[PDB]
Structure formats: C-alpha cells, structure tokens
Amino acid sequence: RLICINDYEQHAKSVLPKSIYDYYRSGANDEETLADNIAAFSRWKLYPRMLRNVAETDLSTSVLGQRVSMPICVGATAMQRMAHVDGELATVRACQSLGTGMMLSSWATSSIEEVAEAGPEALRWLQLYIYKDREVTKKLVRQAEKMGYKAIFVTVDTPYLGNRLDDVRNRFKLPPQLRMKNFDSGLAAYVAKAIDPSISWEDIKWLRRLTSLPIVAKGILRGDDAREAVKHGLNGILVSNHGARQLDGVPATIDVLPEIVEAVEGKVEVFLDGGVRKGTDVLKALALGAKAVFVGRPIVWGLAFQGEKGVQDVLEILKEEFRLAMALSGCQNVKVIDKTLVRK
Numbered sequence: 655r656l657i658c659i660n661d662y663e664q665h666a667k668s669v670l671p672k673s674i675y676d677y678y679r680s681g682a683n684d685e686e687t688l689a690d691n692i693a694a695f696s697r698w699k700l701y702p703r704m705l706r707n708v709a710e711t712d713l714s715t716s717v718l719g720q721r722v723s724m725p726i727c728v729g730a731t732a733m734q735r736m737a738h739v740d741g742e743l744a745t746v747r748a749c750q751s752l753g754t755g756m757m758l759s760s761w762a763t764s765s766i767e768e769v770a771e772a773g774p775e776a777l778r779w780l781q782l783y784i785y786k787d788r789e790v791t792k793k794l795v796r797q798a799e800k801m802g803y804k805a806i807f808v809t810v811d812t813p814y815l816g817n818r819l820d821d822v823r824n825r826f827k828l829p830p831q832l833r834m835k836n837f838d839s840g841l842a843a844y845v846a847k848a849i850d851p852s853i854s855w856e857d858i859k860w861l862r863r864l865t866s867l868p869i870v871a872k873g874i875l876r877g878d879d880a881r882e883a884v885k886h887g888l889n890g891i892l893v894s895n896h897g898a899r900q901l902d903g904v905p906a907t908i909d910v911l912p913e914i915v916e917a918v919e920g921k922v923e924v925f926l927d928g929g930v931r932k933g934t935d936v937l938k939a940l941a942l943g944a945k946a947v948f949v950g951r952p953i954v955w956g957l958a959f960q961g962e963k964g965v966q967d968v969l970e971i972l973k974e975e976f977r978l979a980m981a982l983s984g985c986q987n988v989k990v991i992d993k994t995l996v997r998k
C-alpha cells in the first residue's frame with residue numbers, strides 16, 4: 655500500500671470527511687503559494703558527489719542544543735483529533751519512538767499536560783500565539799516551562815487568519831465531541847475574537863523577558879525581519895509561510911531560505927517548513943543552510959491512515975528517503991551537506 659508521503663495524502667482523502675480533509679489541505683485564496691512550496695523544491699537541482707564512502711550514514715543533528723535522530727521534526731498542526739481519536743497523543747508517541755521533536759500547537763485538541771504525559775521522553779516544544787488575553791498567554795508559557803518543553807515557537811504571521819476558501823464554503827468548525835484543550839469559517843472568527851492583531855516587536859520584548867526558554871520566530875519571510883528577531887534576543891528563525899495558509903502569493907519557503915540564512919550571519923539557527931514531502935527536500939533545505947525542517951500536513955495524513963503507527967510510518971519514510979538522498983549525494987553525516995550540492 656503506502657510507500658511515500660503522497661500515498662498517505664491520497665489515502666487520507668479517501669477516509670476523512672470532506673470538511674476535515676479540506677481544512678487540513680487548504681491554502682489561502684487561489685492557492686498559488688501552496689503549489690509553489692512544492693514546485694520550488696523541484697527547481698533546485700542536486701549535484702551529487704561520487705565515491706565518498708557512505709556505508710555509515712549518520713542522520714543525527716541538534717535543534718537549539720537538543721539532540722535529534724534526524725533533521726526532520728513535527729510542526730504544529732491544530733486540532734489533530736479530527737484526523738484520528740488519539741490526535742496529539744499519538745504524534746508525540748511517534749516522535750518519542752523516532753527520536754525527533756514535536757512542536758505542539760496552541761490550538762491542540764490535547765492539553766500541554768496530556769501530551770507531555772504521553773511523551774515524557776520526547777523532545778517537545780510549544781507553538782504560541784500571543785492571545786488578546788496576556789494572562790492566557792503567560793499560563794501557556796508557564797505550563798510549557800514546568801512540563802519540560804524545551805522551546806517556544808512564537809507564530810508571527812497570523813494577526814488575522816488567512817482566507818481559506820474551502821473552510822468558508824464548508825463553514826469549518828470542530829466536530830462536536832472535540833475542543834481546543836488548553837483554555838463563514840468558524841476558525842477565522844475564533845482568531846478575530848481571541849488572537850491579538852496588534853502585536854509588535856514590543857510584544858516580542860515582553861515574551862523574551864517572560865521566559866528563559868529558547869524562542870524561535872515562526873513565519874518570517876524577510877531578511878530585515880529576521881535581523882530584527884536576532885536584535886530582540888530570539889534564538890532561531892522558522893522560515894515559514896504557514897503552510898501557504900496566510901498571505902497567498904508569498905514566495906516558497908525554500909526560495910526565501912537563503913536570504914534569511916545570509917541575513918542572520920550565523921547568530922541563530924534557521925529552520926524551514928512548507929512543502930517538505932521527500933528526503934531530497936530535506937537535503938536541499940540543509941544544503942541551503944537550514945538546521946532542520948518541520949513537516950505539517952504529512953503528519954496529519956499519518957494520523958488519518960493509522961494513528962500513532964501512521965505518524966511513525968510517515969516519519970520513517972522521510973528518514974529513509976533522507977538517508978538515501980544523503981548517501982547518493984556523497985554525504986556521510988549532516989555536517990558535510992554543503993551549498994555546492996544545490997543550484998537553481
């Protein structure tokens with residue numbers, strides 16, 4: 655049956671209700687960036703070295719000082735229990751099995767505590783939105799800290815929700831037996847009521863004083879903004895267009911990655927998400943300077959197939975495709991994945 659990430663998406667389309675599949679699949683508006691996040695990877699070509707000795711390929715690396723088994727981590731995707739009953743709990747258990755990290759959504763269908771208890775040994779980080787209610791915001795950060803989450807990924811590209819046309823057509827909302835457990839399109843209205851469109855760099859200063867955990871700015875697309883995040887004492891940049899779900903017509907993340915890596919001058923780690931489906935995608939992102947990449951939708955499709963096992967399978971497919979891509983390119987470990995491997 656399912657031997658690559660595209661197969662898991664096709665299976666998911668066959669077994670999820672239309673409104674749930676569409677919520678997970680959609681991009682904003684005409685979905686130009688959604689297509690480009692995938693097409694852009696294909697424009698970057700690989701220049702493999704031969705005869706390097708790849709008997710022993712080591713995929714391990716570090717994210718903000720914490721070891722991971724591979725440079726492929728789970729990105730925040732809201733409300734995972736729509737795809738499968740165990741939702742976030744499963745994801746975290748799969749991450750623990752694989753030895754990689756899970757970024758937990760602020761809009762999870764499982765609590766910060768339920769997920770930590772399910773994956774105590776897993777590397778876990780919290781994705782944060784700055785809520786209008788700063789007491790809501792602080793108690794999410796404090797709960798992450800106490801529960802041995804290792805970083806905060808603050809999403810900075812969502813003052814308002816993007817306009818995902820299928821959610822508006824389907825009048826998206828949660829199934830009746832589910833909730834966000836940490837507290838037109840139903841979700842766009844929720845954002846308008848709950849999430850602060852006023853936040854500025856002053857709020858980043860606030861958050862940077864609030865916690866000693868590492869903080870990564872998620873959703874940066876400009877070098878100037880990245881340099882501002884470094885000036886504010888943040889510890890990494892996640893180059894992201896929110897899975898193409900926010901402003902349509904922004905570039906693909908793999909295309910803006912080199913500007914961001916150049917702008918930060920090695921001062922903080924730079925990560926990528928958006929369109930990662932294949933081991934060669936991971937290799938290209940690392941060659942252009944990313945420390946690791948995050949996967950969003952493939953994880954949801956792993957849930958839709960077979961829950962915890964299905965997330966494990968998706969992660970193992972990515973790991974094996976990445977291993978093969980490294981070996982065929984002449985790379986024994988991630989430290990030798992250099993810029994000459996790629997050209998656009």
Ligand SMILES: Cc1cc2nc3c(=O)[nH]c(=O)nc-3n(C[C@H](O)[C@H](O)[C@H](O)COP(=O)(O)O)c2cc1C
Pocket residue numbers: 677678679691729730731732759760761781809872894895896897898899927928929930948949950951952
């Ligand atoms: C269904 C879905 C729900 C998402 N929920 C969140 C969220 O709660 N918080 C967040 O910061 N980003 C959210 N994102 C954006 C993802 O973190 C990530 O940037 C994006 O999925 C990466 O692209 P990919 O799906 O192509 O891998 C979501 C994306 C999707 C598809």
